[PDB]
Ligand binder design. Structure first.
Ligand SMILES: NC(=O)c1ccc[n+]([C@@H]2O[C@H](COP(=O)([O-])OP(=O)(O)OC[C@H]3O[C@@H](n4cnc5c(N)ncnc54)[C@H](OP(=O)(O)O)[C@@H]3O)[C@@H](O)[C@H]2O)c1
Ligand SMILES: Cc1ccc(NC(=O)c2cc3cccc(O)c3oc2=N)cc1
Length: 316
């Protein structure tokens, strides 16, 4: 049920449904599970141009509105501007295309998906002849201006950013003539990577931190090393799970909720979708919180340093 108030005065449900699934998973699944998530109780839905599921996720949302389960106002829908669209003249059409695909009139949240700008083209990841990705140099404040223009048009209720470090946040915040600061920063966050001081910064700036891969990434081989720890097998999460008679995933999600973090949870399994909303049913003790805090190992699951050269690369 619970929402947080955004600095532009809109309200974001603190539990969101992540919709990304690898190209293998048939697109029809995005429709089914998103309806399941809405039936379960999720009211915040996270998607992006990159995910290649906006049509199906939007269709699920329209279906739940049309069968009378919720109203458009109950749903908080996020899309993300992909990095090949950072040039300002590309921002508004990318949003309009996302809206045409999803068949909604606005998104509640439009994010700059990443700070690392890419070469403009109808290619999602443009490669040169050696197969390496071609970067673009774009002053992200101009991107932000085009985002603000989308807000004024009513195409996006709120606007924010994703995968931005402290300096990139402040570069947007110091911007001359800034009309709107980001309501949120959506970054990887979980017990192995808590973002304690990035979160503290954000709290100071009235910017929500939004956790993704908060259950530990889907452990895709293309992006994640198999030798990495599996977050849900962690001894302390498993112990706390058995103590509260919950699951390690529920522990992780509740952990974020009690540090004032809005948390996403991907699941394409009906049981787990309906289990994840139980995060509102129990509390962790202050000592449980301390013990989960103790797991912080500054661990990225997404191996990104193949892009270390990028001037806007966030882990510089
Ligand atoms: N801004 C960004 O750059 C960025 C990057 C990555 C992701 N995201 C967003 O964040 C969302 C979630 O992050 P994510 O895709 O990395 O996955 P995640 O939320 O970390 O979930 C990881 C895996 O945990 C499993 N799981 C879910 N609920 C469970 C439960 N109750 N018990 C045990 N296992 C459970 C799921 O598998 P099953 O499907 O089998 O349940 C899922 O594949 C994405 O879907 C996407 O919308 C954003
Ligand atoms: C130069 C450059 C620009 C952008 C990126 N980023 C990614 O590859 C992403 C992968 C991804 C994967 C799953 C879900 C997401 O939400 C994702 O979001 C991403 N931004 C990397 C390098």
């Amino acid at each position: 049920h619970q929402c947080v108030k955004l600095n532009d005065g809109h309200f974001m449900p603190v539990l969101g449904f992540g919709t990304y699934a690898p190209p293998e998973v048939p697109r029809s699944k995005a429709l089914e599970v998103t309806k399941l998530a809405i039936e379960a109780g999720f009211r915040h839905i996270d998607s992006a141009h990159l995910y290649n599921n906006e049509e199906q996720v939007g269709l699920a949302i329209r279906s739940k509105i049309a069968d009378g389960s919720v109203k458009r106002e109950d749903i908080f829908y996020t899309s993300k501007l992909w990095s090949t669209f950072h040039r300002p003249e590309l921002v508004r059409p990318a949003l309009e295309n996302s809206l045409k695909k999803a068949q909604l009139d606005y998104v509640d949240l439009y994010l700059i998906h990443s700070p690392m700008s890419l070469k403009p083209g109808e290619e999602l990841s443009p490669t040169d002849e050696n197969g390496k990705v071609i970067f673009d140099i774009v002053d992200l404040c101009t991107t932000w201006e085009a985002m603000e223009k989308c807000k004024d048009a009513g195409l996006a209720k709120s606007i924010g950013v994703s995968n931005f470090n402290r300096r990139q946040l402040e570069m947007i915040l110091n911007k001359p003539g800034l009309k709107y600061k980001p309501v949120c920063n959506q970054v990887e966050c979980h017990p192995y990577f808590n973002r304690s001081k990035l979160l503290d910064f954000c709290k100071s700036k009235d910017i929500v931190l939004v956790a993704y891969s908060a259950l530990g990434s889907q452990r895709d081989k293309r992006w994640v090393d198999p030798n990495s720890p599996v977050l849900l097998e962690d001894p302390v999460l498993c112990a706390l799970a058995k103590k509260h008679k919950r699951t390690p995933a529920l522990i992780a999600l509740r952990y974020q909720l009690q540090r004032g973090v809005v948390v996403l949870a991907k699941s394409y399994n009906e049981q787990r979708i309906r289990q994840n909303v139980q995060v509102f049913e129990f509390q962790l003790t202050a000592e449980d919180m301390k013990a989960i805090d103790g797991l912080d190992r500054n661990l990225h699951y997404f191996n990104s340093d193949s892009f270390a050269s990028h001037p806007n690369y966030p882990y510089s």
